[PDB]
């Protein structure tokens, strides 16, 4: 169910590295992908890149971008973000509390806490969760 | 075990995450303490708590940023990596209460107490060659 909702996203990311390109200047890109610690202030900019990809990847599949799918933020994080910033990146995206992460029918936000758990699996290879 | 297997895999997949960003908030002295083969006395608990945590909420503490719950696979990975067999147990004792990835995802509060943590992190450490400590680490104070 979600397993799939991932896949469709991972396969989307893997495909973007070519055919399409995101709203990202080689600067913002070095910024998002490098190992250079994201200093406090950088919050606004990090968010805006992670979004650039998240929504971007979305647009480049035909999926709406009203609530950003959890799986995409996790993927967009795992894939692009460097370990030096992963965790912090999650707590940053939580900050873009767009959808109330469906967990037992209840409309509960997309807490940073779970975003990590996701990205951590993506990288792990699993995602054949459930 | 096809379950206990994927847990490990995530824990392993974590080591690499830890190795990659060696950003830690500990003086070289502190580092020596945390990785020493000398036991952690009952008074050293405060110090240890700070050290084991400085390894989990990694770059998060180096800079400001709040802290947020980490998955067991990732904690167990940290202990297996930094902590010495001698203190590992107290470490798990310290970090008891964490949750596994699965439960983190579906919202099923299943705190993983010390005993369990200890058992698991020991098996994590038990299996992982491309994991071990070196010196391109003693570069944070």
Curated annotation (Swiss-Prot), chain A:
Keywords: Host cytoplasm, Viral capsid assembly, Viral release from host cell. Belongs to the microvirus D protein family. Assembles the procapsid by joining twelve 12S pre-assembly complex into a T=1 icosahedral particle, called 108S procapsid. Ten proteins D bind each 12S complex, which are formed by three pentamers of F, G, B protein and a H protein. The scaffolding protein is released from the provirion after genome packaging to form the mature virion. It is found in: Host cytoplasm. One of its GO terms (biological process) is viral procapsid maturation. GO terms for cellular component: host cell cytoplasm. Component of the procapsid particle composed of 60 copies of the internally located B, 240 copies of the external scaffolding protein D, 60 copies of each of the viral structural proteins F and G, and 12 copies of protein H. It comes from the Viruses. This is External scaffolding protein D.
UniProtKB/Swiss-Prot annotation, chain B:
It comes from the Viruses. Gene3D superfamilies: Scaffold protein D. The keyword tRNA processing does not apply. Changing residue 58 to V: Confers a lethal phenotype. GO terms for biological process: viral procapsid maturation. SUPFAM superfamilies: Scaffolding protein gpD of bacteriophage procapsid. It is found in: Host cytoplasm. Keywords: Host cytoplasm, Viral capsid assembly, Viral release from host cell. Assembles the procapsid by joining twelve 12S pre-assembly complex into a T=1 icosahedral particle, called 108S procapsid. Ten proteins D bind each 12S complex, which are formed by three pentamers of F, G, B protein and a H protein. The scaffolding protein is released from the provirion after genome packaging to form the mature virion. Belongs to the microvirus D protein family. Component of the procapsid particle composed of 60 copies of the internally located B, 240 copies of the external scaffolding protein D, 60 copies of each of the viral structural proteins F and G, and 12 copies of protein H. This is External scaffolding protein D. The gene is D.
């Amino acid at each position: 169910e979600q397993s799939v909702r991932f896949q469709t996203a991972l396969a989307s990311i893997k495909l973007i590295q070519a055919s399409a390109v995101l709203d990202l200047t080689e600067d913002d890109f070095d910024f998002l992908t490098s190992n250079k610690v994201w200093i406090a202030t950088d919050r606004s900019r990090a968010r805006r890149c992670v979004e650039a990809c998240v929504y971007g990847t979305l647009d480049f599949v035909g999926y709406p971008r009203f609530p950003a799918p959890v799986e995409f933020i996790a993927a967009v994080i795992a894939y692009y973000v460097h370990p030096v910033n992963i965790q912090t990146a999650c707590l940053i995206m939580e900050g873009a509390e767009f959808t109330e992460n469906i967990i037992n029918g209840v409309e509960r936000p997309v807490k940073a806490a779970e975003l990590f758990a996701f990205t951590l699996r993506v990288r792990a290879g699993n995602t054949d969760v459930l």
